[PDB]
Paper text:
[name] [name] crystallized in two space groups with identical crystal morphology and similar resolution limits. In the crystal form II structure, the active site Cys118 is covalently modified to form an S-mercaptocysteine, while in the crystal form I structure, Cys118 is linked to a propanamide. Most likely, the reducing agent used in the crystallization, tris(2-carboxyethylphosphine) (TCEP), acted as a catalyst for the phosphine-catalyzed addition of excess acrylamide from the preparative native gel electrophoresis to the nucleophilic thiol of Cys118. The propanamide has a hydrogen bond to Ser59 at a distance of 3.0–3.1 Å, which supports the idea that acylamide is an accidental suicide substrate for a nucleophilic thiol. We have ascertained that the putative catalytic residue is indeed nucleophilic and reacts with electrophiles. Crystal form I also has one 2,5-hexanediol bound per sub-unit in the interface between subunits. The ligand density is poorly defined, and most of the interaction appears to be hydrophobic, but there are hydrogen bonds to residues Pro192, Asn196 or Glu71 of the neighboring chain. While the active site interaction between neighboring subunits is contained within the pin-wheel tetramer, the hexanediol binding bridges the dimerization of tetramers. Furthermore, one sulfate ion per monomer is located at a salt bridging distance from the stacked guardinium head groups of Arg7 and Arg174.
[name] belongs to the isochorismatase-like protein family, which is a group of cysteine hydrolases known to work on vinyl ethers, conjugated primary amides and lactams. The crystal structure of the monomer consists of a central six-strand parallel beta-sheet with alpha-helices on both sides and three C-terminal helices that interact with the neighboring monomer. The quaternary structure is an octameric cylinder, which is built from two stacked tetramers. The pin-wheel arrangement of [name] appears to be vital to the function of the more closely-related enzymes, since each putative active site is made up of residues from one chain and the C-terminus of the neighboring chain.
Numbering used by the authors:
A (entry chain F), B (entry chain E), C (entry chain H), D (entry chain G), E (entry chain A), F (entry chain B), ...: 2 to 203
Amino acid sequence: SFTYKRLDKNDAAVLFVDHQAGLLSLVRDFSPDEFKNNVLALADIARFFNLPTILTTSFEDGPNGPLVPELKEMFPQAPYIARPGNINAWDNEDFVKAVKATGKKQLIIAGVVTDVCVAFPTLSALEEGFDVFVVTDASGTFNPVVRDAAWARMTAAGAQLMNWFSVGCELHRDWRNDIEGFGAILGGHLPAYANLIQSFGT
Amino acid sequence: SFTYKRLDKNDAAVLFVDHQAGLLSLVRDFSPDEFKNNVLALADIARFFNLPTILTTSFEDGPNGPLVPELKEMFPQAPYIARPGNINAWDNEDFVKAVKATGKKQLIIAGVVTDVCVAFPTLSALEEGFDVFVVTDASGTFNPVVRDAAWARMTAAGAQLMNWFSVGCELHRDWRNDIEGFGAILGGHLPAYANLIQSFGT
Amino acid sequence: SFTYKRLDKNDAAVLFVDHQAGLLSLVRDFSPDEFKNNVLALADIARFFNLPTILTTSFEDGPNGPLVPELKEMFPQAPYIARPGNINAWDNEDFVKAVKATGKKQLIIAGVVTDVCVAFPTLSALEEGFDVFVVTDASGTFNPVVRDAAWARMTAAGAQLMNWFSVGCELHRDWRNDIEGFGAILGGHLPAYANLIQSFGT
Amino acid sequence: SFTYKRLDKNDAAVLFVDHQAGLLSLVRDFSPDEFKNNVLALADIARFFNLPTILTTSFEDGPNGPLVPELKEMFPQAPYIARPGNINAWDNEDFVKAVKATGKKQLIIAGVVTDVCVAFPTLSALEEGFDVFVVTDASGTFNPVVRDAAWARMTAAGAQLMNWFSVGCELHRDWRNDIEGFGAILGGHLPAYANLIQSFGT
Amino acid sequence: SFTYKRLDKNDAAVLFVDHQAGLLSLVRDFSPDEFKNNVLALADIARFFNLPTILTTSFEDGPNGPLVPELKEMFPQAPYIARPGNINAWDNEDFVKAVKATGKKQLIIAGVVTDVCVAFPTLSALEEGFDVFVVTDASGTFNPVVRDAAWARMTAAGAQLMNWFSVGCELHRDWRNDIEGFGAILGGHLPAYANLIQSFGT
Amino acid sequence: SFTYKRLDKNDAAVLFVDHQAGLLSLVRDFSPDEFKNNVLALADIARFFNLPTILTTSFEDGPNGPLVPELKEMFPQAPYIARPGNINAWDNEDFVKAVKATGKKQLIIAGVVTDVCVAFPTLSALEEGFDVFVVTDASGTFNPVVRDAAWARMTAAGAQLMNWFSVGCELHRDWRNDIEGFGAILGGHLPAYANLIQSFGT
Amino acid sequence: SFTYKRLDKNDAAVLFVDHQAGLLSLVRDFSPDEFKNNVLALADIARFFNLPTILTTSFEDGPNGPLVPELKEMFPQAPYIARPGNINAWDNEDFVKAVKATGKKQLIIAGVVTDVCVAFPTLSALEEGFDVFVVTDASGTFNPVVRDAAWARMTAAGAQLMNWFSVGCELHRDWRNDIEGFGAILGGHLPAYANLIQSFGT
Amino acid sequence: SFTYKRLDKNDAAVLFVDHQAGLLSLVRDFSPDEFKNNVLALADIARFFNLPTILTTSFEDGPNGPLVPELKEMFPQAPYIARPGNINAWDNEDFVKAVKATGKKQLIIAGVVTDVCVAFPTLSALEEGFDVFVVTDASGTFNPVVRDAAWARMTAAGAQLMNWFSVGCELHRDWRNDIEGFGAILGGHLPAYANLIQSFGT
Ligand SMILES: C[C@@H](O)CC[C@@H](C)O
Ligand SMILES: C[C@@H](O)CC[C@@H](C)O
Ligand SMILES: C[C@@H](O)CC[C@@H](C)O
Ligand SMILES: C[C@@H](O)CC[C@@H](C)O
Ligand SMILES: C[C@@H](O)CC[C@@H](C)O
Ligand SMILES: C[C@@H](O)CC[C@@H](C)O
Ligand SMILES: C[C@@H](O)CC[C@@H](C)O
Ligand SMILES: C[C@@H](O)CC[C@@H](C)O
Ligand SMILES: [Cl-]
Ligand SMILES: [Cl-]
Ligand SMILES: [Cl-]
Ligand SMILES: [Cl-]
Ligand SMILES: [Cl-]
Ligand SMILES: [Cl-]
Ligand SMILES: [Cl-]
Ligand SMILES: [Cl-]
């Protein structure tokens, strides 16, 4: 009938694909403020659950620009695959080697742009039998129309569309595993929730 | 072949998941006015057809805050499961125990937020063979994008996307079962329909 | 494999469901000017191809109000089923009686509201094996969210989502079948196309 | 399982359907500036990868108007099928004859309007076993609602929804195949990317 | 130099103009739920400060329909001027007599539609030297464009554009005048504020 | 002090400026359906109050195209000034001669595009001491941004921003002058008001 | 004659009015992410130019909640006026005393909500001859409509409408006064500008 | 007391302020495609009427980036003022010297961003008695809210808000001055108008 394949913190890896200084100016389907916070939220979550994290860039020594400094600072030890040519990250042998080295079946992916640098390796990974979870609000593209088309194409392939908050909650399962630690993530990336915490504290 | 598995007032139960004072401030994909009306509309419908109703909250003794007073006031005998830790309500044994105690195969679900507190138990219930009917306009989340992603994930699982008005009409089937009572629900939650009623009365 | 099941002018019937004066004030996902034009466009198309047309209303002697005068004036010989109680038109035996009396397998349907008076008989007709074509822009509801949920529910059942222009074009197949007649329909319901015709005529 | 059926520059043909001067005034779901740029972007891409290109128009000696001069100028040797009557291009034998003469199984299609001149031959081609790739941002129609319905109908048939940028990247595979040539396309149709290039050049 | 002409609860009167069941179906620049709540909010405020209130309708014995029952129920002794013909309420001598009988210099006005039934008497009252305060969110019309044009016309005439919340706060001046009474109004018409109250109460 | 300079049916003239078949394809800040209805509504009002009407076009024997047939058909005896070159209609001596020949102090103006063919003669007429009333929803332009700028420029000049409905009501003053005649206009151009009339008639 | 009265870093004071945990949940005309960034942006600017800063709250010991911790952390020596009752901060004698103690004629103001806690003291300050500069994107309210009404009221009174970025640039005047220092503010609150900086640095 | 001060091609100069590769990535209130077309349209117009043109940049040897090559290409003899520090271009003595050297009192201004690099010299120039005409659609900024605040501030100072099309038409006055030359500009920057020309040409 149906199988609920939900995120497991022991079976998941996170992929940050081409969050580069140049490419980010192409993102117009999210505001710069929301998009920065959403990506950093996913990064905090990846760091909080000690998930194997993989960083990759496309043509970073050109107009595409360098990876945002936050990602390198937060994951200084993570596999960093600079792709000089391959647009689909899965066409890069070093990238795929790094993914399989994690030993994780679940791939949490976010990047720029959604319709290409996210969609292409998502479709490729799905073909190889990976369970792919797309962080839709940490992935950006030219406009809502292009985004919706990318969703349709990935949905049809069996990708699970989610967001950083749902990713965090599905990984955490139970508040009591770490109340303050998890609460700090929510408070740090949901200003309305930070307000609830502060009011509750008085 | 396709089977129109529609709501039966003798086979349906209603689940209100985490409509709490704090969490409601996170809902931005509906205006506070429309969302309040939609939730209360579903509640009136649940009470009107005497459907087994289950109330549940998440970490209500924290920033998430208490359940809205209207729900506790309207359903004083309904099972009330306060979940101290489990984010997915289906991971709470008392919640599932209460759901199965109703003996209903059809689950009408609404809550906050859509992508988590609604989506997770929906996927879990669908996995167990339940027919899940999602009240999309009585469920709120951070923004339309997160909402649309939640829809995609629930749709792929076989969840039926509906709304409080369609839920009521599918339950009621025939106007003549109770013209005044059902009309009062419509008039009380559709101001435009209330206007039609008043004009017709003159 | 996929089969292009397209509209045939010898096998299609049109269903106008509850386009009533009162209920139309509930429609907010289309502007009153656009919605009136779209419905009348579908009507002109139904009449142009001499398609079997069925008119039905819900509780017309109440706040729901009478059928819009245009539909009755254009189809004075069409079966007119006033449903006193059944919300789903397919639960009315006389309505179903009229549909099957046409001998048409393809059902072109439009009405108010989309999530109920269109969705419910669409799902019912799909269950009995009918090919149902929904005229999405001649069907109205409370808001875009409710509409999108209704689309999702009908889509999963196998309904084909279309619009009055595509319905007309799929029925007509070839311009040369009636250049003057078909062009008059397009010009009469697409002001931009009327402008092209006038400019071309000088 | 799932198969990533991606565009191959050796197995793909591009179809420009009815981008005519008159019909373009019907397109309102894209701004005239963006739509012009998107169509021309797709054209540059088709020429860059030397893809078999087919131009077709509908009733061009009438109000529909002539094909835009750019398409005829850029593809002077491409098959040009002026369709006298058939609205669905696949109902035109000369058009289908030209498509099959390319020997390409992958069809990249764009045109006006989306719900008819794109949707109909897309569904027809899918029926014959072609892999159809729809350039959603190079296809225009009356409004977003009509667009979404067309997407739903084509998605249900197995069409792959894409955009000119993703189409180009999936065709190109690797930057190093032609850095200057491919970069010139991006800069020429993404003003933001042109800005990245100029800043990088200083 | 500038003079802050702010609302004074001893020098202000409230005018409810043509909030009738029929005319309300014309209001599309606000949703039915938000508009009802806003109008009732202004009514609660008017009653709370015991402000001289005037009710008026236009051609109520026709399609325009009766005044909403809430307004008559809340102000049973307030002057009720049924205007059989005059569109501008200020052209009705009984209406003007009632306005001046209050002896108030400040006129708080709301109604349907904004561009006519609000704008016209606003401009007329400003001409006679009244200080007119427009409750913009308790006044509805066909669309945002019509709204903005009406604002511009009233702005140029010297009308002060406000909303029910700002009207309430400017009248109240100080919380300590009546904390419970005023808080009940806010909580009863701001679902977000009611939630703050409930969380604070636990 | 402020003076309410309202429309008088004995002191007003209507100016239709460049509502031509070609130029109308430039109008994108209104949908083709609503814009057609609004212009025809203004036309009906001008004819209903027997107001001196002036029709003018710009370079009609070129791409701009002919005046829409409805306007000439409704006003066959009205002054028709085809402007060969002058973009500002007020720079055309025949146009100004016709305006002053009406002997009317109040100028009701609508046209295409708003920022030019409406704005320029509006400012010119305001300079000559005319009272100018702009029908904003019967005037179209490229986009909302351009429209708002045109509003700002005309507002600063002392132009009164209105719409066809408010224009009609300010001219009519009292329903009882002609209930049936005026009601027919409203019903004929407000699809929702037509519905109110039909329900009231039952 | 017009005088450009622009911000002077030696003659300006900054007012933060009621940016409280509870009241912030009422702000819906900005996303929580952009709004938090904008307020913190203004705070960094106030600190960067060492401007006299004044913090004030309204009924902080109730549902309104405490001031956001960032403001208190950044301005430990700033005047902190807790207003127990007065809604208009200018009706509070300690607040006005603190404002006049700065000796600054130019008031940069931001707060929650715009139509009340910002508008009221703005109008009051303008009455006392102060030059008031409104930071529109660091001020929040219920919805865009209420915001625009507040703008109209403050504009008509002579307030200068601005935003944190324009405020900063007008204070800074010249880049060379502190290139690195000012650039850090821009980079820290404009993610798009931070990207330009990083790309430029490689 | 109103004087229509319209653009004169013998008394006007054009100012392009900081249209730089870096700063353009900050513009989000216009799409990259529309904004590029709008700026280039203004440039073509400036060149067409041989208007004195002044180019200026802000900190171009930094993240702000170089001036777009098109402006530099079209005006190789125009005064080029690179401002190393002054944010307000009017604070640069070389810029003001160049403006006054043209001998033009009417200033046509466009740039990035609207609220700063356009607003500041606009306000300064108005102070010195210049007539300033703002090309609103050739000026970009962070978002519509920031845009509108800038409009309000410039409007209050007496700036005339326009757009490139209206600017061109007000300069051209009469079509017959140069039919083909002016028509080529319109056709080259209005795709909908280009379509009219092509259809008319057949
Ligand atoms: C916490 C967030 O909602 C606001 C914090 C800013 C205003 O300092
Ligand atoms: C929308 C309509 O029900 C308004 C109701 C009054 C009470 O505000
Ligand atoms: C009680 C109200 O403020 C919250 C809205 C709930 C009823 O959905
Ligand atoms: C065909 C239509 O766009 C013209 C009729 C209206 C503009 O008067
Ligand atoms: C008469 C009008 O208000 C209804 C619109 C269409 C459905 O007839
Ligand atoms: C710098 C900003 O544009 C993006 C930074 C986030 C994506 O880590
Ligand atoms: C490059 C693009 O973003 C705008 C600049 C034009 C004017 O060249
Ligand atoms: C819109 C037209 O004028 C330009 C041609 C584009 C569609 O290639
Ligand atoms: Cl590579
Ligand atoms: Cl639990
Ligand atoms: Cl029945
Ligand atoms: Cl053919
Ligand atoms: Cl009267
Ligand atoms: Cl002329
Ligand atoms: Cl106080
Ligand atoms: Cl300088």
